[PDB]
Symmetry: T
Subunit: 89 residues, 12 copies
């Protein structure tokens, strides 16, 4: 059990993205949230096992989705909180 943070940028809000991401997590058994940042980015935080975070990291990059994902930056995270489901904002 471990949580990662990711900062996705590009055409990423308003294009079903925080939903798809949410949904895609829950499907991988993850918990977290996708939050809409003011710059235009989406900050996604998920927690599960590391290979389930890889799969999401992989989805976040190349996955089939409406959004035009220009970059995903993984960030180190020390939060070990039990998030409920996978929430938007």
């Amino acid at each position: 059990k471990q949580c990662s943070k990711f900062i996705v940028s590009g055409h990423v809000q308003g294009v079903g993205f925080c939903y798809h991401t949410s949904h895609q997590g829950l499907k991988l058994g993850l918990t977290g949230y996708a939050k809409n940042l003011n710059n235009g980015d989406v900050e996604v935080v998920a927690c599960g096992t590391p290979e389930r975070l890889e799969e999401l990291y992989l989805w976040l990059q190349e996955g089939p989705k409406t959004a035009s994902v220009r970059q995903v930056r993984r960030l180190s995270s020390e939060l070990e909180h039990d998030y409920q489901g996978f929430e938007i904002l």
Copy 2:
């Protein structure tokens, strides 16, 4: 803008609504999928046009459990802001 879709076929009771709304929330669309009495499903959807085109094309060709016979996009001029994508 908002578009309206009459779907006719074997559309009620086959997860059609759930699926349609799933598909829409994934495109960034807002609207509803209402069960009509005749047997059709009405689908109202708002987003950017190219997105509603996507949705329209799914309603027609998209892989689903339902047996879609026709997809008529009716015109009309609603400019309300819908909540999510609900099933009425």
Copy 3:
């Protein structure tokens, strides 16, 4: 004690429904304000005929963001208790 109102004009997405629902909750009225596919807003409101007149007036010339062109009062024989003043 309910009346039906068919507000036409630039009335969707321009706070008209939140605003109307508020203005009628202040008159002690109940009912709804539902958005219609042609671009109109169907406002149904229940109360004493006098508060109805205040509200009919308010729909026309009151201050509001919306550009209201025409308000057509319609008859209604409707005796159900509406809880609050919902949107749609």
Copy 4:
């Protein structure tokens, strides 16, 4: 296995929708009873046709507060799980 009904007379604000849902839910049915502008009540039940018959009969002869002049069955090709027995 979903029927439409139009009930007419003195039938709104007289508990009718509510009692109707209650009678339906006892029969094991799901659907709604909606208040219509003209005064009439659109009740849509769903279940086994005998139960749907049972509700037709209650809609006609059943001890109730409302004064029911006419109950007209209409046809429905609604093929949909309705949650409870809503009032609308």
Copy 5:
């Protein structure tokens, strides 16, 4: 209009509140049924007076679990829309 009722006897925790709220919703009434620290139940119900008479009768001789001993109709000049028929 609204009336207030002060039901006394073995009338608490014996279904009486649920029952009255049910029975009142079937007459198309609104209001409440509140448990009082002396053991009585306060029933406020709002409707047409004839329905209120029906309910007033119901409280007395109606079939119901509770052993009612006395019902003292009070004045009440309250004109507030009560949503449904609550408990407490």
Copy 6:
């Protein structure tokens, strides 16, 4: 005090659970009606023992839509404060 009731017959799908939970709430009881896999309906109900005989009897001969074939009184040593009368 609480009791356990295993009812069998034509009891699922036929509004039995709601109707039971209704009768319960009318006699002042608290409990649940759980739909079992075998096709039986497990009813747990709590209150004064006399009221539990009324329910145990209504479970047998009480007018209802379900076709009750057998009612099985099981020994329960539970003492939990149950919410309303939930359908499970």
Copy 7:
């Protein structure tokens, strides 16, 4: 810093409770407006005493639908953080 007010006149079912709570929340205040049997409205606010004076005045002179005969400040010794500005 919580006052109690008893407002009297034609004040119930005339949007007064609702307009009051709105005016309150605009002012920064928390409390309720409760409908009383005799007819009067029990408004209880909580804030800084200026905002409390502002509301006093609004209750008296404020443009509103109701006809306010009397407003009697009535002194409270209560601290409890009321969450919103409820209607009761």
Copy 8:
């Protein structure tokens, strides 16, 4: 059985109601801790008596944030089932 407790002191705004209901729920009690206008807190509690004693004892002596001055128990009777232990 239910009991009533008027607690006077520095009891409002000091977690007294929260803490009281926390303590009750831990003893298996149901009821409510209502802030009164004078400044006291009413506490209605139901359970086995030996539990109401415990609460009464905690109410008086129990470690808390509030500054209790007098703990009067009043007339028991009142035989309702309260949902949880609430705060109002």
Copy 9:
């Protein structure tokens, strides 16, 4: 028309219950996927036999996070209207 399925393997905490729920919802079904002590999921779906077949297939073969070992079909008699598609 309600089939029960005991799914086994690495099937808890892997999104399977969510996922299974989304698939049954996509096929027009209602039911639940509950997590069992042994490590297993019991999924209970109710729809048409063919829709129940698509699902039994998916549980087996469908793309999913989990590592299914074995899906057994157990027999059921439950004829109850499950709400949506929950997770327990």
Copy 10:
């Protein structure tokens, strides 16, 4: 399209957030007003740029309880659909 506003002054606790969300929902906007640790209130508002200039105006000159010193317009590049006009 969206915009960002940092309002500073005597703006917290004086009903500013509410009143802002009210003007907001009146102009048809969506967004939020978030109370900041520094003492300023961050308002985000989404809609037609003319309605934004209306809100931006009202944030300065608008009749309100708050004592507004300065209103800073920031770059918001946002695009997210916001629900109501929430208070954070």
Copy 11:
């Protein structure tokens, strides 16, 4: 991270126990449920680190609580489901 199950028996329902337990668990960072069984017992399932499951196990035993706890029997559990908070029933 893991789950255990405990069957606590004695005078255990109607005496604030399922509330206290839920509460005690939540304070230990655990999630699970306290379920009222028909026999008179209380089934408690809780999830977290094993030293946090000890603390609850130890609580359940000697901890000060209204109930009259006669026996606590720990049972083996293979469930690894994310439970939301700590629920009663």
Copy 12:
């Protein structure tokens, strides 16, 4: 009278947030304890200076599951009303 508090150590996933929120509710306070990315909890509480003091104390020396290292007091100018005691 709204203090902010950055707590650190092994303080996430250890029931701290729940527990802090319960201590603060016991002290008659409102506010939140939110989990931060670095590992830290930021607890924001609002009440009377001394109540904010017992909390500051408890945060440090109070019995709790967590391993607190350092508690810093910070800021603040929040003059906002916070609901209950949340977790973020």
